[PDB]
Amino acid sequence: MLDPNLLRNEPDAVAEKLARRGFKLDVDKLGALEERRKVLQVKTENLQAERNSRSKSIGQAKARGEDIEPLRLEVNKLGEELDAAKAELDALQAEIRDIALTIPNLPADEVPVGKDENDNVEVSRWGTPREFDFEVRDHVTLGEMHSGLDFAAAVKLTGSRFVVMKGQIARMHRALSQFMLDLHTEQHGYSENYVPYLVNQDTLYGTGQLPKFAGDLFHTRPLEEEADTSNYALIPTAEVPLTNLVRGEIIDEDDLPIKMTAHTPCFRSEAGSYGLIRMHQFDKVEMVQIVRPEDSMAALEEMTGHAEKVLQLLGLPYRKIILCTGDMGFGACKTYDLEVWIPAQNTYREISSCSNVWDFQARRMQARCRSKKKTRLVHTLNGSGLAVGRTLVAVMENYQQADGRIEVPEVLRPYMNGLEYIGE
Amino acid sequence: MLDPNLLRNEPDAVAEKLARRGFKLDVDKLGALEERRKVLQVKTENLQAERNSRSKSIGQAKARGEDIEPLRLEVNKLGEELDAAKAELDALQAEIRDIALTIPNLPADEVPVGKDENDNVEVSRWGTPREFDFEVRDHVTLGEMHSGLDFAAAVKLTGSRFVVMKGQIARMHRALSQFMLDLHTEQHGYSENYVPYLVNQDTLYGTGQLPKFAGDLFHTRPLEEEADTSNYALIPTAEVPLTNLVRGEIIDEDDLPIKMTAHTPCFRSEAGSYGLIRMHQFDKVEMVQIVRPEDSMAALEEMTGHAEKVLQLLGLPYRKIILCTGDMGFGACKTYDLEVWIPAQNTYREISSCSNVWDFQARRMQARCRSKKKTRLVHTLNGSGLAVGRTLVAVMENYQQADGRIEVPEVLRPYMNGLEYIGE
Ligand SMILES: Nc1nc(-c2cccnc2)nc2c1ncn2[C@@H]1O[C@H](COS(=O)(=O)NC(=O)[C@@H](N)CO)[C@@H](O)[C@H]1O
Ligand SMILES: Nc1nc(-c2cccnc2)nc2c1ncn2[C@@H]1O[C@H](COS(=O)(=O)NC(=O)[C@@H](N)CO)[C@@H](O)[C@H]1O
Ligand SMILES: [Cl-]
Ligand SMILES: [Cl-]
Ligand SMILES: [Cl-]
Ligand SMILES: [Cl-]
């Protein structure tokens, strides 16, 4: 959520910034509700003043032995009017909140104005794409040659946009996630976490999947024996459980930054999309940071660096892209995307997204920090380090040999019993 | 499913064997439906004989120039009677099938007759429980001392029967699953697999979770853009996707055994149950075997051995229990359970279940083998090698020191950057 004070005091500048990312802030609707809220706030106060007075008058009557019955009808009619007003006020505060929750984050000033993917700016690149001395085979070809990718088996087991990985390919996918977690926990100061893969409605509201993106998720039907408390959704990213670990907390500023990593499957309905490029299930090693507000922009650099180190150590050429206002996620105020070289596509494909979410989720979770005094909202960040299946594609394609074998990157050989190549 | 021929030809012996496991086979209901099926089969044949004859008579009329209109009414009335009969027959064949699918597996003759957990027989044991020279702390205590188990964080993120693991505890849990997969793939001839965690209705019918155990599962609501093909359930065990990989196949007997392993989260509604002992989500390294019918009992020994090797290499004392007729799972014909020593409970707790499922799932999946000649059903087996959270509990409790630190078992130190102990 955005600061309610900016929406009440500077709506025209908020709308101006939100328009840059393609959101039209309905200033007139919002202002009408906001105005009716103040009118109701006063109406309850006046009704309470009148009730207290008539009730103090009913006291003078009971003391003077007067007819204390007409004033009793007066006080009860006021008590009803008060209740109707508090009811209208609560319903109104709920409508404003519902609206507040549909508003995306305000973008950082250094974010370039743009409409879509074509307006994102390349800020840097590393490594040089391999000059192949043969016809480049794609990851589906390479997978099937090695009997390691089986899309038909997954359709039989579940349906489309699912995969079954077998043998050395499955081992490589596994090695990649172990290498990522070990890098981040042993070298980048992240603490490892095993989190639930099903989360509740409060958690989803916390990181911003709710109320607007329910359709992007897999929802589980409630359990018979947990009838009213098991309305769960499958996690779309480890950012969701990880960021919510500080939900409703007041952290000592000296205990910040909190750096968390986790390796989980990720589940996406993939609505609106028509091999291992966009699945319903995919693994990702996630990085989450809880920081002081003064440190989030530094933390974004640090975290992107951590994601970049995975690519560098695996010898995978990539480029760093700053997203434009119109290509960011709902909760982001600034995003860097890392795009890896895919030989078979003769282009760079997204492998990570690192964002500074500002105080947007902290406001929804009421995640604050103290100095050591008064409290204020922390900032949150999240980035992939990395999306494992996309890394596997990149490794298979970039390390393929003329004979169809796949060279195991040096850093993965200890995770693969010292194996030099996939296949014979 | 059981062999339809045993149910039709030897029902009294089938019922006798099923009663041993507490199932009352409704021989009289089944026999009534079976009988009405044969009557309908004949009724359709007679109606077809009559229609063909009257239709051949209608031909003699068209040839002789006779009134070929009454016979036309006769042939169409017969065609209707045929349709009603084929409709009654199909509805009946569906009722019989529905019943066939509720019947549990017939138990092996060496399975002891018993009513519950108290009638299971200990067949062997390994190792001696540690003689503690201090007050034994439980895994919740040990977890919390090391800030590695957080049950309150999981309730906030999702709800009850979920856990959040952090730091060296999460690392140890991770190390355990890596050690298990590496043991089974490098030493026990299992091929590694990355499978979907959501599966379809056919898959669930295949391994036997359906039709009887829908309530034990988490079900996902169908996706808007996959409206009629996304009625999925979360996998309760990797046995489900793994065993179904051979569904509808005819395997060359020389390609058997098929040995598959996988590390997945497992999701159970846990209906009827009132720390890390019975969660809604838990990890398990599963072993699955597809074998010739002559090899399943040998394969059960082999697989239990593979599960036992995990416990031995981790220096964890355990006992091997043969389940009695009344304590087996629906699809099992024979089960060995490995139960590990839990110091804080002064008893052995289940860590693995290894079963010979016979041709029960193979019959549902129509998974057959040829020699490279004619075909016959394969046998399937599955066993935990092992349930990861239960192994973590066992390791934390059995390796705890007087100062609260946890000694890292020798085999896990390479998976934990050479760490000797958890905590300082
Ligand atoms: N549906 C999907 N399928 C696959 C995929 C990957 C490999 C094989 N098969 C499928 N990757 C996805 C994906 N959705 C996202 N990703 C990959 O995940 C990365 C990060 O995802 S993101 O949505 O851009 N951002 C977050 O979720 C944040 N928590 C930061 O990680 C992206 O850069 C992609 O590489
Ligand atoms: N709900 C549950 N929770 C936990 C658990 C474990 C650790 C921490 N928290 C929870 N373990 C379970 C469990 N249900 C089963 N297990 C563990 O899984 C083992 C095998 O499960 S079983 O249902 O007995 N059999 C299968 O699923 C077969 N696929 C063979 O593995 C059992 O022996 C238990 O140790
Ligand atoms: Cl429902
Ligand atoms: Cl505030
Ligand atoms: Cl529905
Ligand atoms: Cl048969």
UniProtKB/TrEMBL annotation, chains A, B:
PANTHER family: SERINE--TRNA LIGASE, SERYL-TRNA SYNTHETASE. Belongs to the class-II aminoacyl-tRNA synthetase family. Type-1 seryl-tRNA synthetase subfamily. Residues 30-102 form a coiled coil. Residues 171-409 form the Aminoacyl-transfer RNA synthetases class-II family profile domain. It is an enzyme of class 6 (ligase). Catalyzes the attachment of serine to tRNA(Ser). Is also able to aminoacylate tRNA(Sec) with serine, to form the misacylated tRNA L-seryl-tRNA(Sec), which will be further converted into selenocysteinyl-tRNA(Sec). Keywords: Aminoacyl-tRNA synthetase, ATP-binding, Coiled coil, Cytoplasm, Ligase, Nucleotide-binding, Protein biosynthesis. One of its GO terms (cellular component) is cytoplasm. It is found in: Cytoplasm. ATP binds at residues 268-270, 350-353. This is Serine--tRNA ligase. It holds the Pfam family Seryl_tRNA_N. Homodimer. The tRNA molecule binds across the dimer. It catalyses: tRNA(Sec) + L-serine + ATP = L-seryl-tRNA(Sec) + AMP + diphosphate + H(+); tRNA(Ser) + L-serine + ATP = L-seryl-tRNA(Ser) + AMP + diphosphate + H(+). Consists of two distinct domains, a catalytic core and a N-terminal extension that is involved in tRNA binding.
